[PDB]
Amino acid sequence: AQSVTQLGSHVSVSEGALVLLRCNYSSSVPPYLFWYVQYPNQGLQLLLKYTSAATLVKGINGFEAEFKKSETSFHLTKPSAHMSDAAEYFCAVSEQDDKIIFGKGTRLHILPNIQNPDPAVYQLRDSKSSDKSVCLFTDFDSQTNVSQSKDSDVYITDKCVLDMRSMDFKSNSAVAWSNKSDFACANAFNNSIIPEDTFFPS
Amino acid sequence: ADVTQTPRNRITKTGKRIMLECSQTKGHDRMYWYRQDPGLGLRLIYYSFDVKDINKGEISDGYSVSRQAQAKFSLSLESAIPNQTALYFCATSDESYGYTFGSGTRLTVVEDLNKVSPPEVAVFEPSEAEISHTQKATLVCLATGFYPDHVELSWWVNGKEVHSGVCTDPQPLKEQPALNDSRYSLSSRLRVSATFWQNPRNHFRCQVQFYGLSENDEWTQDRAKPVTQIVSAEAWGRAD
């Protein structure tokens, strides 16, 4: 009815740990409630819904949600976070007997389990270079975050996690680049707090 | 194959009339148009319970709709403006909240078509030091100088699309953040074993599908007409 609330546009969970995404509603009479998932550049897929039957509702992939009227909640849970769970999740509610209204969405970020981090900054060269390169900061654990550049001619991306399925191996990276004659990979990430043991090859 | 919407991707200029079309085969009374924006979820624009019947949703200003048939529900931007840039979804419902969504329309409204520009794409080969230190090898693709922000980047190894070992930035960055019509840049990584990179028979391609002008559009500049197109860059493996 009136509304549905999801707080935190972006949330984290450790790989392997319990997934819990919160949703609350405002409706005097219990509504129907829905959780949808969306992968990048894809559409909406229904995970599960409460339709006044069982209060404990089970969905695809180990997802479940309990409808709790006295705390007006319908939190989505899954036993263990897998890397493939990285997506945007939306809770939604019936309204005015004629529609579904959607929450704002929360994007779930899964922090890979890195037992042996190996932080490094590497320089990479253009495959058909006229003397062009970028810098790759990689193999740091999720206690590191990458800050935006303070130099308007140096570009720095957000950290991104890849999962090399071939070796069951996940890693974080960010990329920096510049046209500047003065630019060096040693200095590229100087506005970020990097591990003290970051590898800087010759 | 119940609910279909057209078009899938569209770039338009400010001021043009645009029509998005939703069709269904089940003949459900209830049809809906929603838009999706980052951080806001799906917001209802308009909805209809019969050919005789139209109802405003929470964000109806700048839109109109028509229920021309049990099967069809059209959404019109009367005079498109840049803040109508969004992903749009039509839906049907049965009488018990069983929704079926269409697969979406990505619409970009640009003020000035003269600023449209395809990406330049480059692949940067793995570092020798990475290879020695880790026995893995990360390629980086950079797509730069493109406008508007309406692209899809994918990786192709020996002619087959790959998803494993890939991470692409979720949003491009602005090359000139102070500018309203800044060009964009996007990066992506593909990581493979050093063994696989070191095989000179292996072929790696980064592909950017760019959405731009159509053949109908006028173009008065000397530079290439910035039509929808694919721009790639490639590298072969190497054992030095």
Numbering used by the authors:
A (entry chain A): 1 to 202
B (entry chain B): 1 to 240
Give the published text.
The key molecular interface that enables T-cells to sense these threats is mediated by the clonally expressed T cell receptor (TCR) that classically distinguishes between self and foreign peptides. The TCR governs T-cell specificity by discriminating between self and foreign peptides presented by MHC molecules. One key feature that is likely to facilitate this level of cross-reactivity is flexibility within the TCR complementarity-determining region loops (CDR loops) that form the antigen contact zone.
We generated 12 structures of the F11 TCR, that recognizes a peptide from the influenza hemagglutinin protein (PKYVKQNTLKLAT) presented by HLA-DR*0101 (DR1-PKY), between 1.58 and 1.89 Å resolutions; 5 structures of the DR1-PKY specific HA1.7 TCR, between 2.31 and 2.98 Å resolution; and five structures of the 003 TCR, that recognizes an HIV-GAG-derived peptide (SLYNTVATL) presented by HLA-A*0201 (A2-SLY), between 1.26 and 1.37 Å resolution. Moreover, we also observed loop movement for the F11 TCR structures, which were solved at an average resolution of 1.55 Å, comparable to the higher resolution datasets for the 003 TCR. However, several other loops in both the F11 and HA1.7 TCR structures were also free from crystal lattice contacts and did not shift between structures. Thus, we conclude that these loop movements represent real differences in the conformation of the CDR loops of the HA1.7 and F11 TCRs due to the intrinsic flexibility of these regions. Although this analysis is an approximation and should be treated as such, the average maximal loop motion was slightly less (6.4 Å) for the 003 TCR compared to F11 (8.7 Å) and HA1.7 (9.0 Å), consistent with the structural data demonstrating greater rigidity in the 003 TCR.
